[PDB]
């Protein structure tokens, strides 16, 4: 082991550079590290392009009168199509009409 220099009267090419090396791998863990998500003013009564925590779709958002069980995020109608969601941020149930 031989030591370094790092004297303040050294030029670039002799000064200490801190190095952080990140290593990533993505195989199997379901809950892992991502970047924040960021949202936006949830408008209502307008045909918009929406995404509710993964659910991608199109439609008009309106106040609902359904009651989800605290563990449920969204509902589907007969014929297996999403017809209501719960806003992840505000936790309100909204119907989706075509």
């Amino acid at each position, epitope marked *: 082991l031989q*030591s370094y220099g790092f004297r303040p009267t050294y030029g670039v090419g002799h000064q200490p550079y801190r190095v952080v090396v990140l290593s990533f791998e993505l195989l199997h863990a379901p809950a892992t590290v991502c970047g924040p998500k960021k949202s936006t003013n949830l408008v209502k009564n307008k045909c918009v392009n929406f995404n509710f925590n993964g659910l991608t779709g199109t439609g008009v958002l309106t106040e609902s009168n359904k009651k989800f069980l605290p563990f449920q995020q969204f509902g589907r109608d007969i014929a297996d199509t999403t017809d209501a969601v719960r806003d992840p941020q505000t936790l309100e149930i909204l119907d989706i009409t075509p």
Partner: antibody, heavy 117, light 111 residues
Framework: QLVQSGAEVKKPGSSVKVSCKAS????????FSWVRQAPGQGLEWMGR????????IYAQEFQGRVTISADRSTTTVYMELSSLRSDDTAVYYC??????????????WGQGTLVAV | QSVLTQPPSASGTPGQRVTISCSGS????????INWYQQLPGTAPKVLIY???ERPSGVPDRFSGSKSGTSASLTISGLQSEDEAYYHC???????????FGGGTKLTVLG
């Protein structure tokens, strides 16, 4: 905390061992300087020592006639001086180099040994 | 006698501010800091001020350093009756690649 060896009179042309011992914190992190003081006068600089790799570094006025090393097995620093005369009858201080930044400042600073001839 | 010349002596009245200055070549004294130490006789000396402004802990407040250009000056406001001592400049120097010290003024507090 630093502690010193004995202070004693020698004969000219001899070889002299002095040892400083550390206690109070870690030892390898710090370095150790070694300065010299003629009696009644001002300091100067004699020899720097790095206990990490065993390297020593000196001054161009008094390179060669002193060697300096240390061991971290019991945190003892040995300075050996050769070619003494009536011009080295001086007090010798080991010192803790405060690494700081931009300043040197000479830390806890210890206590050194008189050397007479 | 070394690379940073110290004026040798100074004295005068107690209880008064005084100053002492150190000025050498621009290789170190106009390029790097000037720390200051104090030598009490009969024992091992101390440290007084690093980086020309900041004291360390424990030491009093009335001493103050200044790196007024090439003039490094200690001001002693409210001089007391215990620090009859030898005050020593210090500086890192890139020329000799080492700390270099000075003779230290033998500052004496009268009775």
């Amino acid at each position: 905390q630093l502690v010193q060896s004995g202070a004693e009179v020698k004969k000219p042309g001899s070889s002299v061992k002095v040892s400083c011992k550390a206690s109070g914190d870690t030892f390898s992190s710090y370095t150790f300087s070694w300065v010299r003081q003629a009696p009644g006068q001002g300091l100067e600089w004699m020899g720097r020592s790095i206990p990490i790799v065993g390297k020593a570094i000196y001054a161009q006025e008094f390179q060669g006639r002193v060697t300096i090393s240390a061991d971290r097995s019991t945190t003892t620093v040995y300075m050996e001086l050769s070619s003494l005369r009536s011009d080295d009858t001086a007090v010798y201080y080991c010192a803790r180099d405060q690494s700081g930044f931009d300043f040197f400042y000479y830390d806890h600073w210890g206590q050194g040994t008189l050397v007479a001839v | 006698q070394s690379v940073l010349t110290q004026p040798p002596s100074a004295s005068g009245t107690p209880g008064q501010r005084v100053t002492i200055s150190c000025s050498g070549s621009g290789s170190n004294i106009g390029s790097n800091t000037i720390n200051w130490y104090q030598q009490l006789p009969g024992t091992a000396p101390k440290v007084l001020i690093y980086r020309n402004n900041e004291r360390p802990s424990g030491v009093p407040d009335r001493f103050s350093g200044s790196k007024s250009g090439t003039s490094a000056s200690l001001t002693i406001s409210g001089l007391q009756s215990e620090d009859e001592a030898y005050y020593h400049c210090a500086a890192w120097d890139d020329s000799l690649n080492g700390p270099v010290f000075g003779g230290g003024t033998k500052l004496t507090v009268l009775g």
